[PDB]
Write a protein that binds this ligand. Structure first.
Ligand SMILES: Nc1ccn([C@H]2C[C@H](O)[C@@H](COP(=O)(O)NP(=O)(O)OP(=O)(O)O)O2)c(=O)n1
Ligand SMILES: [Mg+2]
Ligand SMILES: [Mg+2]
Length: 428
DNA sequence: CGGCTCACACT
DNA sequence: AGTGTGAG
């Protein structure tokens, strides 16, 4: 079991929110640009950054005023604001454009607003059959990188030169006659991804990057290797060298506490080092599921299927009221619950029309001042009507007990966060 | 005051 | 049903 059974691709839009703004606002194109929200506080928080802007060191989770210091000419596009909160509708709609195009080629799993996993196994089989021993031209893979290539013995000075040489080595090595071979399958998968990315760009004007491999983790990792506007094929064989110097945190789901735990407990830095441990050893340290996943993953093997899901399982609205802005009155809490409910209602109504389904559960989450937990309390009630007033009213009923204060016209402790989430969808 | 938004494991 | 982790 070499985990070479599937052909999986992860496609991620390059600086997605920026591209959406750049398409709509042509003046932003091919310039250091960022997308920000909530301009009032420090010029707004940057949530997307063009590659021209990244050259100046501008990053996500950076204040616009600070970004300006690094990049004086940085152009900014503001996230739409509705009812006192950021509205992401344009980006969701832009996302739908991309997802629908991708869906034409194969079943997709919407991993995020700007990326999706594709299981191309079946599509590859069909493509392999359509061409009988047809040699795969380099022209079919104009933006493809083969990780780990070129290897061995002035063209390579340029990145395009390196890409070509690597591709040539790979293609020269490829034997068409073996329809079964995983490398061949990955290659054909890459050809389809080229087509998928060309279609996306032609039809949306959005550029994207892609990773092609035998699983989701490798595909996602591969995608990031040659961003932007490029796709990378990571073969099973490329894994040992790739993982040998690959920081553990870089593997998906290893970015947080578990990753640090793996590093600290095992005293290792790289993904490859995990191979020297028995599955039982890994299981003992990190649990049954994690241990087995780690044992297989460090060998480039993962079995997490590409879920056939294009739609979010939940629709959520929330707002932060940090520090001084915390809501300390009942009226204040009710008004904000209403604003969140109103946006939620609009999105829910659209969802029902577009997707033939209804949310049956309303989830309410709040944060009181002095908690470092993202959520202080979680509570749920039935969502029976797509009405903002009822939903906000119900949400308030569910969380009204949290209010310590006797006066009751005041709210204590003050709420630093309000969250409304529609869940438990059903067909209709 | 890196904000808003999802998915999912564990209990 | 609720809490926490991880991600984008
Ligand atoms: N913390 C984050 C991460 C992403 N996003 C949004 C903005 C991003 O443009 C979009 C996609 O996330 P992302 O793929 O990780 N980064 P982005 O697409 O902007 O650039 P790339 O590095 O992928 O090329 O989700 C966000 O709002 N908050
Ligand atoms: Mg992206
Ligand atoms: Mg992404």
């Amino acid at each position: 079991a070499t985990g070479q059974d599937r052909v999986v691709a992860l496609v991620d839009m390059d600086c997605f929110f920026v591209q959406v703004e750049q398409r709509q606002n042509p003046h932003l194109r091919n310039k250091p640009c960022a997308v920000v929200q909530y301009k009032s506080w420090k010029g707004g928080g940057i949530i997307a950054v063009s590659y021209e802007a990244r050259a100046f060191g501008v990053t996500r989770s950076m204040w616009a005023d600070d970004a300006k210091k690094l990049c004086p000419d940085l152009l900014l596009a503001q996230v739409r604001e509705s009812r006192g909160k950021a509205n992401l509708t344009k980006y969701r709609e832009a996302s739908v454009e991309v997802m629908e195009i991708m869906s034409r080629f194969a079943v997709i799993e919407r991993a995020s607003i700007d990326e999706a996993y594709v299981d191309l196994t079946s599509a590859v089989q069909e493509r392999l059959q359509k061409l009988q021993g047809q040699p795969i031209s380099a022209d079919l893979l104009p933006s493809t990188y083969i990780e780990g290539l070129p290897q061995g013995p002035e063209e390579t000075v340029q990145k395009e030169g390196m890409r070509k040489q690597g591709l040539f080595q790979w293609l020269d090595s490829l034997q068409i006659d073996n329809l079964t071979s995983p490398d061949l399958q990955l290659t054909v998968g890459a050809v389809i991804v080229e087509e998928m990315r060309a279609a996306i760009e032609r039809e949306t004007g959005f550029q994207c990057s892609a990773g092609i491999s035998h699983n989701k983790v490798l595909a996602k990792l591969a995608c990031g290797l040659n961003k932007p506007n490029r796709q990378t094929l990571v073969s099973h064989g490329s894994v040992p060298q790739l993982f040998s110097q690959m920081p553990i945190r870089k593997i998906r789901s290893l970015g947080g506490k578990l990753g640090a735990s793996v590093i600290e407990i095992l005293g290792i830095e790289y993904m490859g080092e995990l191979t020297q441990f028995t599955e039982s050893q890994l299981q003992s340290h990190f649990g049954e599921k994690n241990g087995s996943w780690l044992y297989a993953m460090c060998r480039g093997i993962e079995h997490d299927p590409v879920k056939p899901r294009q739609l979010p399982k939940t629709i959520g609205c929330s707002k932060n009221f940090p520090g001084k802005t915390a809501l300390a009155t009942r009226e204040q809490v009710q008004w904000w619950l209403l604003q969140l409910a109103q946006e939620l209602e609009e999105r829910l109504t659209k969802d029902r029309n577009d997707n033939d389904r209804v949310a049956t559960q309303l989830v309410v989450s709040i944060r009181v001042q002095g908690d470092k937990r993202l959520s202080s309390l979680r509570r749920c009630c039935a969502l029976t009507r797509y009405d903002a007033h009822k939903m906000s009213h119900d949400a308030f009923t569910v969380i009204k007990n949290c209010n310590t204060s006797g006066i009751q016209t005041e709210w204590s402790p003050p709420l630093t966060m309000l969250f409304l989430c529609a869940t438990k969808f059903s067909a209709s």
